[PDB]
């Protein structure tokens, strides 16, 4: 919650992430994703599609409390983002909880 902004910035610095909807689905198909984030105002049909893929590949999903505008800013970018995947956690412990 409060510390997600802190943990997310660390994964950006050390680990590797993938941004967007088309790439997130490709990551889930390969089976190498460990954690996905879904923004608050994503369309409900898309939101249910992402969650069903996660159930198939057994990866946890965390529901971000902000819009697509501030999910992008939390990643240090200058553009909106509605969903993302994490391929590896670096010096961060975001996978622990």
């Amino acid at each position: 919650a409060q510390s997600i902004g802190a943990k997310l910035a660390l994964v950006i610095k050390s680990g590797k992430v993938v941004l967007g909807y088309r790439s997130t689905l490709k990551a889930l198909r390969s089976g190498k994703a460990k954690l996905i984030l879904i923004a608050a105002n994503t369309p409900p049909l898309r939101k249910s599609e992402l969650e069903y893929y996660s159930m198939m590949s057994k990866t946890p999903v965390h529901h971000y409390s902000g819009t697509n505008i501030e999910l992008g800013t939390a990643c240090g970018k200058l553009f909106r983002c509605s969903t993302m995947a994490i391929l590896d956690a670096g010096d961060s412990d975001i996978l622990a909880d």
């Binding site: 198909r29 089976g31 159930m55 590949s57 057994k58």
Partner: protein, 135 residues
């Protein structure tokens, strides 16, 4: 992990067969020279069996319970995977990416798919596979 295995049941999303349900015969996670992307080789149902009632006669029962199959190679982006599986020993190496180069080979493959799918349906298993989707 991996769910696009060789027994997964999926739904086609685009094309002439949009809305039908298929079983994966062989996954290809790396693109070949043709189709340079993730794709799969599947067999499916084009015309589902018709409805059946306890009051019908044997001759009318057998005439209504018949299936029309098809074979296809599809991009992964045009599939929707489900949580069901259909493991049949009759469909092991029916299609191997070269049957799609000879029309005579396509007919033989579809002839075999019809024979195997028909017996399983009569047995009374995997009813979700043989029931059409309403959308």
């Amino acid at each position: 992990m991996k769910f696009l295995k060789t027994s997964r049941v999926c739904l086609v999303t685009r094309g002439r067969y949009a809305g039908k349900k298929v079983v994966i015969i062989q996954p290809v996670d790396q693109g070949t020279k043709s189709h340079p992307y993730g794709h799969a080789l599947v067999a499916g149902i084009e015309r589902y069996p018709s409805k059946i009632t306890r009051r019908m006669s044997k001759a009318r029962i057998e005439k209504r319970s018949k299936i029309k199959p098809f074979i296809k190679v599809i991009n992964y982006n045009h599939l929707m995977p489900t949580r069901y599986t259909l493991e049949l020993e009759g469909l092991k190496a029916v299609i191997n990416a070269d049957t799609f180069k000879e029309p005579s080979q396509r007919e033989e493959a579809k002839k075999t798919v019809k024979k195997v799918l028909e017996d399983r349906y009569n047995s009374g298993k995997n009813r979700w596979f043989f029931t059409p989707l309403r959308f």
